[PDB]
Amino acid sequence: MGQKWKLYEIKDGKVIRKNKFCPRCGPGVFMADHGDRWACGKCGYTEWKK
Amino acid sequence: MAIERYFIREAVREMLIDEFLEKELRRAGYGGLDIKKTPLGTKVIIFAANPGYVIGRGGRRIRELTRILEKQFGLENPQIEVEEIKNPYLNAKVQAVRLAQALERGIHFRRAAYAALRAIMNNGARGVEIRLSGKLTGERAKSIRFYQGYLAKVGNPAETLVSKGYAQALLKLGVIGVKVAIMPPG
Amino acid sequence: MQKARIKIASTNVRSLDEVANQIKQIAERTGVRMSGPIPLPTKRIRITTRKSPDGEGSATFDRWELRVHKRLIDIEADERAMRQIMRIRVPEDVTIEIELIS
Amino acid sequence: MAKADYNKRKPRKFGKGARRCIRCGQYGPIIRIQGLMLCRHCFREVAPKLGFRKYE
RNA sequence: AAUUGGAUUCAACGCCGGGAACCUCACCGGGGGCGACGGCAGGAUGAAGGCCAGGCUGAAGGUCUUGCCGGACGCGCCGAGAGGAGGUGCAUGGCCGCCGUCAGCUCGUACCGUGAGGCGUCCACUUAAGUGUGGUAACGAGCGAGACCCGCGCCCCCAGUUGCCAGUC
RNA sequence: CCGAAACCCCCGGGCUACACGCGCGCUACAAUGGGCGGGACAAUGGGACCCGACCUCGAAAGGGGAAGGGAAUCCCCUAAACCCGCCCUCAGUUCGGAUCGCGGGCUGCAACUCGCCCGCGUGAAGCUGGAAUCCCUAGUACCCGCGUGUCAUCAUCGCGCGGCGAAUA
């Protein structure tokens, strides 16, 4: 295992999501945002930034 | 495929089930398997000196034997039947498995030989042989040969008439090979 | 009516003839015209094998026979007169094929 | 560390290494392919239950 | 670099190999990697599994930099497993070669000998044979070998969709 | 006995390296011959990602199409030795086929190491073999092809079939 993985930011009475949501499949799958190159999370797909 | 191959397929089917069931049903006292093959549910007839072990200790073994039969074959509803062997002492393969347990147990050679000889001659054996190839508890490769009455003759209408049972009786110092050749009256 | 072929083979001699004879006896008397039980070949199968697991010295070599024999029977009876005759016990170990044409 | 599975993953499309028996579990040792894949050594032990006949 | 190993006079050398380009494969070179079940300390404060992209790899997120998902438990050792075609066939079971498809080995009762044993199973004749014959202080029996089983010549019965200008309007 | 290892996964290489020695075999030193053509003959067997009719293209290896066949009923399939006529006229050759250049097919991811075939060119040793030594006694040896196993592919092997058909005992 690999701690720490608290990368979701916090508002005062809300939450917000740091990372990007994929545009190939639907919402529910986050992007390992490299800055130019997007890995996929569910399975493992070579995606480029849109 | 054709006529020729299928018969051999069937006979190969006999071996894979007769090999496993022997090794398990040494507690029962294994003597055969009358295998009736159908498109409805493969009907195996397991031969034991004693049916009360094969069933199990409360249904477990008969269900266990129903359950491994589904894995090997493509008949997923195989029945189990237990028929007694009518003379297990006329059957040699029973006496081989029965002798193997006794040598596993540690009882002396000529003693463990005498009883055996005596129980099957009482049963009705024109003649009997027990051979025990093995270490014989030293480290020289010598067999001991226990001999009464008639024996296997010449050719092949020799081996069909007689019975022959083989069993590896395991030890923890080595091994001992248990051969038991019975000649029934005929 | 429907001309049926019973094509019946067996791996051993004693098992195949008893069924062929019994099939020609029970069918004889009812609504059946029956052509006689014809013997085709033995496709004797030779497996020719090396005995010794060393493959060493002289090794004596087993000849193997598997002999499979095929009797054939034409019959003129119904599909119901067919099952009546297919009642029979049959040796283990005896393949009985049925083609149906008019 | 971390790595993905292995149970062998190379070509074995055909040859002897393609085969194994249904009694002693070998590649190079004999595999009689008539729908009776065993080694020559097993074959001898098994046959009288098969119904093969020694006689020539 | 490794030319995997074993086999060694008959009885090791077309042998284990009835199938070595990878596979096989056990050898070598290089890259990468699982260790059960218990004890011990750790846990979800997010994977033990997956993954772009370079940087590296003969290739493999494999490895690092780097950023991250799906849903939830596993190192390090310590006993001790699974695995090993890793050693010992002078520790073995099985099977097999050769001596030997040879012609021997035993038991009963009797008999002889203080006894180990003998006799019989020896001798004569005869056969591939303790095979058979005669003799004989022996008479018989089992295994072996023999017949027994399978295959080959000739004929016949049962059965013919293989068989043919056989005989034929 | 081994325990990131004598495990495990992988690619590549090695077993097919050679100055040499031997064993078991194939092919062979020609007129009882070679080409070419024609004609008369078998048997065991094996055949579903398998045998492949037949038709077509390709010089061919093979490719395209496609019947039948899970089998006395279809396919591999042609036997080979034979004989008759024709050309050729005993030389290291029209023997013999090693070695090398090239063109080309076929299987597999892939045949340089290390496959086989087809065509053209290339065209090596060998012209009957010392000492020594092996096998066998009749449908056998001697001789000729034929199939199968294992099996994509390495068969001058192993098992098995029929054709010609003796010497000496």
Side-chain angles (χ1 to χ4, degrees):
Chain A
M1 298 191 71
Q3 307 154 59
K4 194 157 196 176
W5 215 56
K6 182 69 185 189
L7 308 154
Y8 319 112
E9 304 171 21
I10 314 100
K11 300 174 164 178
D12 299 274
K14 293 188 159 42
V15 266
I16 206 74
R17 267 74 71 191
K18 185 168 188 299
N19 297 104
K20 299 190 99 279
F21 295 85
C22 213
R24 327 304 194 116
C25 291
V29 44
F30 288 82
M31 295 287 91
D33 294 294
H34 190 51
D36 85 310
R37 287 280 192 177
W38 281 340
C40 212
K42 288 183 191 285
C43 54
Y45 208 57
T46 301
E47 311 169 14
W48 173 77
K49 189 180 275 290
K50 283 178 67 265
Chain B
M1 210 177 309
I3 301 308
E4 213 153 80
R5 334 289 194 282
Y6 177 60
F7 279 124
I8 41 176
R9 215 155 289 185
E10 289 188 313
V12 169
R13 196 175 303 279
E14 296 179 68
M15 178 38 89
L16 315 172
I17 194 80
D18 220 38
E19 186 180 280
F20 302 150
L21 256 62
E22 199 175 5
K23 288 154 187 82
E24 178 187 349
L25 301 166
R26 301 191 186 185
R27 188 182 76 137
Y30 204 69
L33 192 77
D34 257 5
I35 186 157
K36 285 191 186 180
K37 275 153 284 197
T38 321
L40 191 70
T42 306
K43 307 197 281 290
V44 303
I45 309 171
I46 303 170
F47 269 76
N50 288 296
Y53 297 113
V54 175
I55 292 168
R57 318 170 281 289
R60 264 172 280 193
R61 184 173 271 196
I62 190 168
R63 290 193 251 95
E64 273 173 286
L65 293 158
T66 313
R67 275 173 288 171
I68 195 139
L69 266 164
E70 300 174 13
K71 305 178 198 168
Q72 299 184 242
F73 308 160
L75 290 305
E76 309 270 310
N77 297 122
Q79 271 205 317
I80 316 291
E81 270 83 43
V82 196
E83 276 207 57
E84 59 177 34
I85 312 144
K86 278 77 87 192
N87 298 313
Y89 306 108
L90 197 64
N91 195 327
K93 205 176 199 174
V94 184
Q95 286 313 292
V97 171
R98 206 205 78 181
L99 190 56
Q101 295 303 305
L103 294 148
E104 282 149 46
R105 279 189 208 121
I107 305 176
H108 286 90
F109 296 127
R110 180 176 316 166
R111 292 199 107 177
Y114 196 90
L117 286 172
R118 188 173 52 108
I120 61 188
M121 91 169 318
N122 195 240
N123 204 255
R126 192 160 179 197
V128 297
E129 177 178 318
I130 314 168
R131 203 169 187 189
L132 288 157
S133 327
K135 206 156 75 85
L136 300 185
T137 189
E139 299 181 33
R140 293 296 293 105
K142 196 74 176 172
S143 302
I144 183 161
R145 174 177 187 244
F146 295 91
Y147 217 68
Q148 303 201 311
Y150 288 88
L151 195 71
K153 299 276 204 92
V154 177
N156 284 239
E159 68 148 340
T160 303
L161 298 171
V162 304
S163 192
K164 177 52 161 67
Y166 171 73
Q168 199 185 57
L170 186 81
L171 311 168
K172 62 289 313 159
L173 292 173
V175 276
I176 190 165
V178 180
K179 272 185 169 48
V180 181
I182 289 171
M183 188 170 162
Chain C
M1 290 200 200
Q2 177 177 246
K3 93 175 71 170
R5 149 168 23 264
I6 309 169
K7 180 198 314 206
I8 178 175
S10 203
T11 188
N12 59 283
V13 159
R14 304 178 64 88
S15 295
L16 191 53
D17 194 39
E18 200 171 326
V19 181
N21 189 236
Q22 187 173 345
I23 287 164
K24 82 158 296 310
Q25 197 179 344
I26 194 173
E28 197 57 57
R29 304 305 308 272
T30 174
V32 168
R33 184 192 290 171
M34 199 194 161
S35 187
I38 86 176
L40 303 172
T42 305
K43 300 305 286 196
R44 247 186 303 98
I45 144 274
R46 225 164 248 166
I47 285 176
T48 52
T49 69
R50 251 181 214 162
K51 267 174 136 98
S52 317
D54 273 30
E56 186 52 276
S58 184
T60 289
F61 305 134
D62 273 304
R63 213 188 214 185
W64 302 85
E65 304 177 7
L66 208 169
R67 312 203 165 194
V68 272
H69 355 285
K70 194 173 283 101
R71 317 277 169 284
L72 190 141
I73 283 169
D74 293 82
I75 165 165
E76 183 162 302
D78 308 280
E79 201 193 57
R80 187 182 170 276
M82 176 52 55
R83 187 183 176 269
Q84 201 277 117
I85 292 159
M86 202 160 263
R87 185 68 179 277
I88 186 177
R89 61 216 295 116
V90 299
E92 306 85 76
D93 307 327
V94 155
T95 287
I96 317 179
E97 283 180 66
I98 193 75
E99 198 212 60
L100 291 312
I101 54 161
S102 276
Chain D
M1 316 215 220
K3 96 291 160 49
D5 85 315
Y6 58 65
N7 44 255
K8 296 191 182 291
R9 40 178 191 179
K10 57 193 162 193
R12 57 184 151 282
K13 188 170 194 297
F14 55 16
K16 297 298 307 195
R19 309 295 198 285
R20 296 197 309 116
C21 297
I22 200 158
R23 196 164 192 232
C24 74
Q26 308 300 322
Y27 295 107
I30 308 99
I31 310 93
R32 179 77 207 174
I33 192 158
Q34 279 297 331
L36 33 72
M37 54 195 114
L38 299 171
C39 73
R40 191 167 70 231
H41 329 136
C42 310
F43 204 53
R44 286 203 56 207
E45 297 162 64
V46 171
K49 305 193 195 158
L50 303 181
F52 281 85
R53 305 282 66 218
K54 201 184 286 290
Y55 46 52
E56 303 214 353

